[PDB]
Design a protein around this nucleic acid. Structure first.
Ligand SMILES: [Mn+2]
Ligand SMILES: [Mn+2]
Lengths: 161, 612
DNA sequence: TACTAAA
């Protein structure tokens, strides 16, 4: 059922629009949540996702983020290194990730070391944020135990730069 | 009725030393026609028969390669005929010293020749020049017995020289051919490019009239290094750091300035958030300690490159001036040969005696006596290129005896020698890790246990710092005055002589005796000026020249074509190629490059116009 | 009038 599929996506962690799931379905003969997720993962989020991230998260006020959800990375920059020398090893590696759900954009900082995310991460990949995530001064604090990479294959304009 | 042998050395000091070693105290010496070389006589046994000996020397190269007269006029030859339609002949160098006639008169009656020349690559070329000079005069062969010999040696002692005299061999022709090819290529490139550039820029812009614009396989890359450093300096965008530091006032007497684990943050908001989550705390909790033991390595044997670098950095002397001072000290009899590359003391060196001679100076008396009483540590093993032994002191000296310019060089040399012979430096490093809320901090300190060469080289010493307080994990200390500091990146400064020498050695541009010459040449041609701190700053002429070279054909400036050409020339040295073939191919490719260059000078003119 | 390099 459509309600069953939507609920399944709900506990899975994907918050997608009704028109998004209507557009992303293969054929309404026998639909499977697994194939829906697999085919949606390879597309852009701005056209299929919904609005679940609360407003004002860019600024303060809000303190904690609840729910696993799914976010899309737009850009990654190594904060602890200058722009000219991005391969310098004079500092511990800190990453600032610009994340989106299609409507509101947030910013996250690598509090601890994570190996599953690198500087050459293909833009457009999807991340799950299971657990309770700390919000400090409008910044999402990311740890290795509360971030999971779901992969991503969306057309890359990064190669141009 | 007994035959005579003739032995040629590359320098009179070497000739006299080898003659005195091989002749057990019996040596009759007299001057010759030149007045700059001496002839030594002795009687010995060679090839199983009694023989008279005659030892002499030649001052470096005997001949250098130059064009014929008609093509040395600069105004009657097109600077493109120099590549393939120009004969070249060898002409005497330093004509005041009649080397050819001296060798001819000294070798009138000899039967065997032994070449005691340097084991360098050009030693074989000098060997064959001497053989060309002497061979048509020697008294026949009287059968198939061999008359040409060559001895391989690297150290001037008793046993090494005796072994060299017992292990003779043959000379090599391919190395001489390689050196000749290198000489011909260098001449036919430099004299072709320089003529065209000088004759061009002296006819359009009058500001640089009566000035010489030179091109070569070394000067151009040397200038390129400096102008490329200038390019980095000009193309720089400063940024803004944000560093966080905190102070801990444990034991109510000391204030430790902790260092942030994360060294820098480039985002103001992230730095502010870290500061916000840290400053409202009144405790600092220790997490871990460390008491690792380390060691500072003693310096290696002295080398000409290291001596030049130290003279330029600390003593504040130019490379040419330092070389002149070293040469005067060597010829007066105070230091060894000042142009070596080896960084490895020979196994038969008299280290104990050389250290024992300098046991009366008030500066080193205690250290030398302690070393001689408690034994000497063996020197570090290093490169053993068979050129010459490293630079070591040879006689005692005092500040009154030597001048105020050579005394500093002698002091540095003897201090380096004692440091190489001496022990190592041991220091205990202590690091203490603090936690103030989420973040981490570290505090580091050093404490020396047993100084080694430090007392001989006080500038290479670990600084004295207060010992870190004792603390075990779980203790808590009061923390106060945590704050955020803002810093900006600093642009790099112009190249120094030490850095330029390091780069030239790394890229294989220039030899041991060529780096000062090239630096002085690029300074004299007004390409680069010398400023405070021994820094080389490019001028407008150098900048425009290198930029035009890059725009037209970069292969003339990049510091790898010299290495590629050396690799290509090594083929005939190893016998895997042909001299004519390699020389023709290289000359053809460079001629094509020159023809592409000649009809594209407007690219350099358009940059010359704005400058001048 | 020189030039290039190398002992
Ligand atoms: Mn030599
Ligand atoms: Mn050499």
């Amino acid at each position: 059922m459509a309600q069953v599929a939507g609920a399944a996506l709900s506990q899975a962690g994907w918050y997608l629009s009704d028109e998004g799931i209507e557009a992303c379905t293969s054929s309404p003969d026998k639909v499977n949540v697994n194939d829906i997720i697999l085919i949606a993962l390879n597309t852009d989020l701005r056209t299929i996702g919904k609005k679940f991230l609360p407003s004002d998260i860019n600024s303060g006020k809000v303190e904690k983020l609840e729910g696993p959800c799914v976010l899309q990375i737009q850009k990654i920059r190594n904060v602890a290194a200058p722009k000219d020398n991005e391969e310098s090893q004079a500092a511990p590696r800190m990453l600032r990730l610009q994340m989106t759900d299609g409507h509101i954009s947030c910013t996250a900082v690598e509090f601890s070391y994570m190996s599953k995310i690198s500087l050459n991460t293909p833009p457009g990949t999807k991340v799950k944020l299971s657990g309770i995530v700390d919000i400090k001064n409008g910044f999402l604090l990311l740890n290795d135990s509360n971030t999971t990479v779901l992969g991503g294959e969306v057309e890359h304009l990064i190669e141009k730069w | 009725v007994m035959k005579t042998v003739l032995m040629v050395a590359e320098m009179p000091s070497l000739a006299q030393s080898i003659a005195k070693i091989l002749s057990r105290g019996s040596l009759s010496s007299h001057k010759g026609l030149n007045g700059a070389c001496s002839v030594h006589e002795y009687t010995g046994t060679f090839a199983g028969q009694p023989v008279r000996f005659k030892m002499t020397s030649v001052c470096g190269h005997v001949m250098t390669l130059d064009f014929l007269g008609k093509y040395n006029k600069w105004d009657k030859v097109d600077p493109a005929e120099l590549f393939s339609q120009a004969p070249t002949e060898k002409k005497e160098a330093n004509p005041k010293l009649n080397m050819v006639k001296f060798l001819q008169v000294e070798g009138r009656g000899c039967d065997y020749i032994v070449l005691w020349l340097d084991c360098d690559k050009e030693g074989e070329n000098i060997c064959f020049e001497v053989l060309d000079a002497v061979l048509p005069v020697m008294n026949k062969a009287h059968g198939g017995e061999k008359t040409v010999f060559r001895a391989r040696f690297s150290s001037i002692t008793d046993t090494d020289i005796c072994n060299a005299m017992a292990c003779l061999g043959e000379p090599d022709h391919n190395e001489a051919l390689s050196v000749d090819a290198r000489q011909e290529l260098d001449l036919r490139i430099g004299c072709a490019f320089t003529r065209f550039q000088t004759k061009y820029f002296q006819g359009k812009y009058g500001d640089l009239d009566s000035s010489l614009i030179s091109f070569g396989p070394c000067q151009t890359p040397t200038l390129g290094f400096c102008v490329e450093r200038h390019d980095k300096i000009q193309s720089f965008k400063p940024e803004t750091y944000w560093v966080l530091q905190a102070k801990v006032n444990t034991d109510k007497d000391r204030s430790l300035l902790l260092d942030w684990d994360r060294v820098r943050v480039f985002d103001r908001e992230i730095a502010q958030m870290f500061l916000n989550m840290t400053k409202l705390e009144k405790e600092a909790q220790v997490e871990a300690t460390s008491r690792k033991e380390k060691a500072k390595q003693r310096p290696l044997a002295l080398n000409t490159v290291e001596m030049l670098r130290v003279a330029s950095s600390s003593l504040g002397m130019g490379p040419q001036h330092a070389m002149q001072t070293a040469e005067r000290l060597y010829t007066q009899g105070y230091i060894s040969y000042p142009r070596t590359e080896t960084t490895h003391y020979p196994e038969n060196f008299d280290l104990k005696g050389s250290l024992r001679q300098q046991a009366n100076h008030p500066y080193w008396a205690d250290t030398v006596k302690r070393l001689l009483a408690e034994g000497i540590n063996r020197p570090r093993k290093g490169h053993d290129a068979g050129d010459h032994p490293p630079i070591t002191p040879m006689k005692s000296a005092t500040e009154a005896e030597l001048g105020g310019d050579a005394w500093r060089l002698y002091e540095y040399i003897t201090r380096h020698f004692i440091a190489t012979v001496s022990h190592d430096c041991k220091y205990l490093q202590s690091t203490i890790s603090f936690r103030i809320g989420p973040e981490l901090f570290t505090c580091s300190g050093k404490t020396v246990l047993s100084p080694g060469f430090t007392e001989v080289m006080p500038w290479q010493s670990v600084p004295l710092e207060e010992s870190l307080p004792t603390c075990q994990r779980g203790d808590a200390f009061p923390v106060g005055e945590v704050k955020m500091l803002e810093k900006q990146t600093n642009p790099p400064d112009y190249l120094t002589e030490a850095e330029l020498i390091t780069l030239m050695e790394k890229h294989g541009i220039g030899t041991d005796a060529s780096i000062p010459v090239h630096i002085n040449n690029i300074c004299q041609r007004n390409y680069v000026t010398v400023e405070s701190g021994r820094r080389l700053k490019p001028t407008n002429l150098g900048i425009v020249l290198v930029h035009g070279y890059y725009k037209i054909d970069a292969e003339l400036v990049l510091p790898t074509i010299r290495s590629a050409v050396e690799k290509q020339l090594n083929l005939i040295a190893q016998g895997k190629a042909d001299y004519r073939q390699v020389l023709g191919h290289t000359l053809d490719v460079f001629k094509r490059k020159f023809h592409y260059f000649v009809d594209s000078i407007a690219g350099m003119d358009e940059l010359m116009e704005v400058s001048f």
